Amino acid sequence: VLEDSIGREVINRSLIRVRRIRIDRDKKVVETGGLWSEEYVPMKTIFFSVLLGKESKESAIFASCILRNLRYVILGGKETIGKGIVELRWVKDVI
Amino acid sequence: LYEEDYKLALEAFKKVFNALTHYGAKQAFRSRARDLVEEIYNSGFIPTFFYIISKAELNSDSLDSLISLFSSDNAILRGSDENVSYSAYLFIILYYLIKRGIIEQKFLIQALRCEKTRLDLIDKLYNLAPIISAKIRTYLLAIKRLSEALIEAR
Amino acid sequence: YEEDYKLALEAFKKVFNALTHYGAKQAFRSRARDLVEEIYNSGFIPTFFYIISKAELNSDSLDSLISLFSSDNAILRGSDENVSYSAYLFIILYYLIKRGIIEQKFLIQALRCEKTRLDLIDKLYNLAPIISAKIRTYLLAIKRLSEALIEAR
Amino acid sequence: RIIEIDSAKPYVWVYVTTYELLKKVKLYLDSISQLSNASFSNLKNKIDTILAKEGKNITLDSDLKSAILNEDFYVELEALNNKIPSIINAGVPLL
Amino acid sequence: STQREYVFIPITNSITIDVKITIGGSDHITNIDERGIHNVLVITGYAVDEKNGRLVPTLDPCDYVKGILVAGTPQQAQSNDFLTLKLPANKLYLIRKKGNISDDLKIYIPYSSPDARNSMKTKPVSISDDTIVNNIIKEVFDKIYNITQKEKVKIEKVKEDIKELFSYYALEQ
RNA sequence: GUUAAGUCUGGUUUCCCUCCAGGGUAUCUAAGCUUUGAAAAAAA
């Protein structure tokens, strides 16, 4: 746990910038302009969120049947590059 | 007497642009400006910075013109184009460090001049790392836009 | 009375004629839909740097761009992306010459000599807070004209 | 967002206000102290001793003396009078 | 009608007397009012030949010469080497435009043949060495501008403008 | 024939984003109050 003036730079340089390209499939070289970078968040990164629910007979079913069997989801983009899978922990039953 | 990142980059690029006589030096500096920013991100500022210093081969006379560049608009970077480009990018970075008051000009000229002060510069850069990596990549993004704009692609 | 829409009409006229290939027009349309929101979020100077960086200011295209200020027979050549960024650059510069923000003689003498485009960028950096407020409606009109007249892919 | 200068105290963010907003709060307080028996001499006095320093940029209780805000705008700062309690709760400076 | 005469602003001491006019009219395009110089003509495409200072013509848009504008004709020892011409007061490249013009004028230029004997490789030189700044305020900025030390006590203002607002490209030959 | 000595060179160039999407849908006023109270026939 770092100070905020030092931890900002550390955390920001702690992401993964991968370069990708597009191949000109005739010359089999990089298409002109076809070069870009994508930031990723490392695997095993942890985010914290809350799911709030207002009172209803459905909110009960949601919180007792849906959220209890909701473990893995896909977030964000670049899914076919295998870049979205996420586990949900539910502090309720982790802490 | 505060120049925003883009204004600072403009005034640095002006001297760097007038100091590169042969056009091939300018065209190589363009590629330096286009790749060294993501290098600075990936490998860190300090490693990339000493990498740039080494690729410049300051040569004790490239260094003297590099220093005259700070004073007068009449200076000129001489040497191989692929070395003069790295010396011009080193000037870019030093101009930032100096004008942002992060490191003093005398100390930087010393650490470039001879051997002992260089490791003290390494120490000082590790002390001043969060001050530098805070916003230097925006200044370098401006440098990269300017070099892509004002220098023809090879 | 909104005269920036008439200025947008005449500027769009010039650039819509100066783009021969339809791909260049569609590229200009994408530029128009993107860069106005970009200058809203990011400011004028970063967007201007981005634009001039993707415009390829060689003396060739610079000369076609200068001739656009007079001829209405000038043509912009290059790749579709390059000419679209050059067309948007001409849009901005046209707004700047009109509305008297920049003297046309200074603009032309800067687009000629490479040692003066830097002074041009310096002047534009000095004036950017004014330009950012002025050009919003003009660029929104440019965008509306583009997505009205040029078809999309 | 703030980047410190001339100081030795790390701040990653800061509260920013302007004299126009303070003048508006003062109009609110002045009119409401007359249309009701209530009175807010404390808030009124804080706001008025701030508004007395109009024309200068002011840091409230800190000693920054200079800073660059939101990555773009550089400001010199005076300390108003280092005995004014903060109106905000958190221990962030108020500019 | 009116008629002005351009005089170039070099780093040289060769502009003492080549002219026969001091005021002539009632006002000048170039102005100094507590702010510095204004309405400065920027001749482009021409170089300077400070060896007997004149405006050599070139072909570079990059080459330019700057200078001030006052009424008159040169010394009546000319009319065989000057680029005299009439302008509709709009085609003039001016900076710090403060006072508009009245649709017409006439100007004379210190001019010479392009010297078809050598490649004209130019050199852009500013005017520093403040000693030259002072002898240029005395040489020309006093003789025609008696406004100095009469209404204007701020020499060190008109100083800082002459540094940054006046340059030219030189021949080197 | 014998010896003896290695010397030079140590990453360059290009590409830095392209295309589409730039808002869609619903709601667009509702319910009240629609005149009331004094003066209608005056002295010469």
From TrEMBL, chain C:
<dbReference type="InterPro" id="IPR010160">
    <property type="entry name" value="CRISPR-assoc_prot_Cmr5"/>
</dbReference>
<dbReference type="GO" id="GO:0051607">
    <property type="term" value="P:defense response to virus"/>
</dbReference>
<comment type="similarity">
    <text>Belongs to the CRISPR system Cmr5 family.</text>
</comment>
<keyword id="KW-0963">Cytoplasm</keyword>
<dbReference type="GO" id="GO:0005737">
    <property type="term" value="C:cytoplasm"/>
</dbReference>
<dbReference type="InterPro" id="IPR023101">
    <property type="entry name" value="AF1862-like_dom_sf"/>
</dbReference>
<protein>
    <recommendedName>
        <fullName>CRISPR type III-B/RAMP module-associated protein Cmr5</fullName>
    </recommendedName>
</protein>
<keyword id="KW-0051">Antiviral defense</keyword>
Automatic annotation (TrEMBL), chain D:
<protein>
    <submittedName>
        <fullName>CRISPR-associated RAMP protein, Cmr4 family</fullName>
    </submittedName>
</protein>
From TrEMBL, chain E:
<dbReference type="GO" id="GO:0051607">
    <property type="term" value="P:defense response to virus"/>
</dbReference>
<dbReference type="InterPro" id="IPR053743">
    <property type="entry name" value="CRISPR_Cmr7_comp"/>
</dbReference>
<dbReference type="GO" id="GO:0099048">
    <property type="term" value="P:CRISPR-cas system"/>
</dbReference>
<protein>
    <submittedName>
        <fullName>CRISPR-associated protein Cmrx</fullName>
    </submittedName>
</protein>
<dbReference type="InterPro" id="IPR043959">
    <property type="entry name" value="Cmr7A"/>
</dbReference>
<dbReference type="Pfam" id="PF19021">
    <property type="entry name" value="Cmr7A"/>
</dbReference>
